[PDB]
Design a protein around this ligand. Structure first.
Ligand SMILES: O=P(O)(O)C(O)(Cn1ccnc1)P(=O)(O)O
Ligand SMILES: O=P(O)(O)C(O)(Cn1ccnc1)P(=O)(O)O
Ligand SMILES: [Mg+2]
Ligand SMILES: [Mg+2]
Ligand SMILES: [Mg+2]
Ligand SMILES: [Mg+2]
Lengths: 283, 296
């Protein structure tokens, strides 16, 4: 009888239920608690149904990438709410995030069955996910190996072209390949750089600032470090490095670094200016 | 304008990635490569090839893909299981940190995916190979998802033997089937899926079993420390509940939830499976029976 039961088991597809699906989706639904795509669809005109799938794909990749990003950055909050890994644990959250990457991958074959186009859609998805990981890997490396390597502005920019530019290009490239109708890739790349630098800027600017606790080589920090190095302001250079290495939650210490950035290096205004220029390129 | 020029060149080009960059983020992965065991996984592919007859060329790429997926899944598994050691060596995440290890492992899943397109230039076939790849990685994550949920939310769910077996069909069967199905799909030459599923089940129950048996004889019985609903444990929990051994049932749950490294506590739990629930003999026997299904 044992053999009978085993025989039936190995000759069938693996058993997966609706209820199993729900257990596994808990970390993902918790982060659940588009107009950019619509707007762009005015140039691409994908039929509405197709656009729904592309959109579903983008939401999966995007949400899964944040679930893992929060474990990677040891983030306690996301949009004011407790992060999924603190509620469901790191194990379930990694696994669920990764599962949705592959679920997102499956939705791609439902965008088209035309064999030439399908290969292209998979190559786009694969290439940009590879880029998201390269950029994320460099961002993480710099932070965790600090002070081994202090990136320059140019190195930061290439990291961003991958870490943030990847999913922006993934959405845009899929729509341009599926479009019935110049590439807007350069534009979406620029959008990605502005979005990231503004993310870094705002994180400090609104502190009145988790990036400090995280110890990330943000755009303002990269400017401050290279400015102090260039001016041979040894003590200020080292004090910035010392605070980031503290992985501190102390607001008084966070404010202290913000002041080095405000008063010694003027990195905030410098970053403010940089963003305004990127934005002007478009205007 | 010099800035706008530089910005213009940046956004009108592919992103810049260097081999130095590539090396720097491959650290967690390169570390697990030192662990031995490759030859055997290769032997499996070779033996299977005697039936499939893939040219050596293609078989080589099938193997690179399987190795990348296997090592990447073990990097993540050790983070998930809080494992200190893998093949007598310190785990990548304890050395390079969880963030780099997760990112690197996931990066390697996408590099493996990329290799699939080196298996053929024919669009129909390519589409089936990518679907197999996609389906079985979805299966790997479904299985891991349950093993991990049962363990971390214990005692919310006490799996039965049947549930354990369905989770293993996904958790381990997934990569066994991935390898075989890519090969069957590539073969110029009945499906071996049922066989490879049995192989995976024997593989997993034996891994669960040896983990306790080696410690009871000499191993670390790290599955007790991890809290894993192993095959022996699932049997003991269901046996105790059925036989009315309330205290034993509860003590088994309590020891799993301590996440303990104390050797005597681990040995007390193993001797409970030995003498009180007889879960060890039951497992040895269950294994032997599955092995006879093949030998006979
Ligand atoms: O600062 P990060 O790069 O981690 C972030 O922008 C996420 N992210 C990840 C990749 N690109 C951006 P978030 O501030 O949302 O935590
Ligand atoms: O016990 P696990 O399932 O975690 C294991 O077998 C790995 N694994 C992961 C998925 N299937 C098997 P290992 O004992 O090598 O840690
Ligand atoms: Mg973050
Ligand atoms: Mg991050
Ligand atoms: Mg493990
Ligand atoms: Mg495991």
């Amino acid at each position: 009888k044992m053999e009978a039961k085993i025989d039936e088991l190995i000759n069938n597809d693996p058993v997966w239920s609706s209820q199993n699906e729900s257990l596994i989706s808990k970390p993902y639904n918790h982060i659940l608690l588009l107009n950019l795509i619509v707007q762009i669809n005015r140039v691409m005109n994908l039929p509405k149904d197709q656009l729904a799938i592309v959109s579903q794909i983008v939401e999966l990749l995007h949400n899964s990438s944040l679930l893992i990003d929060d474990i990677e950055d040891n983030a306690p909050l996301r949009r004011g709410q407790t992060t999924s890994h603190l509620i469901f644990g790191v194990p379930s959250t990694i696994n669920t995030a990764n599962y949705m990457y592959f679920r997102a991958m499956q939705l791609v074959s439902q965008l088209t069955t035309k064999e030439p186009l399908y290969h292209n859609l998979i190559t786009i998805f694969n290439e940009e996910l590879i880029n998201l990981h390269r950029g994320q890997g460099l961002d993480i490396y710099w932070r965790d190996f600090l002070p081994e390597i202090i990136p320059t502005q140019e190195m930061y920019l290439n990291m961003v072209m991958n870490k943030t530019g990847g999913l922006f290009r993934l959405t845009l490239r899929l729509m341009e390949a599926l479009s019935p109708s110049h590439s807007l890739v350069p534009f979406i790349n620029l959008l990605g750089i502005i979005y990231q630098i503004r993310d870094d800027y705002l994180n400090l600017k609104d502190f009145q600032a988790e990036d400090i606790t995280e110890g990330k080589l943000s755009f303002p920090i990269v400017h401050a470090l290279n400015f102090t190095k260039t001016k041979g302001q040894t003590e200020q250079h080292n004090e910035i490095l010392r605070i980031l290495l503290l992985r501190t939650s102390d607001k008084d210490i966070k404010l202290k670094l913000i002041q080095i950035l405000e008063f010694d290096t003027n990195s905030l205004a410098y970053t403010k200016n940089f963003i305004n220029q990127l934005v002007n390129m478009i205007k």
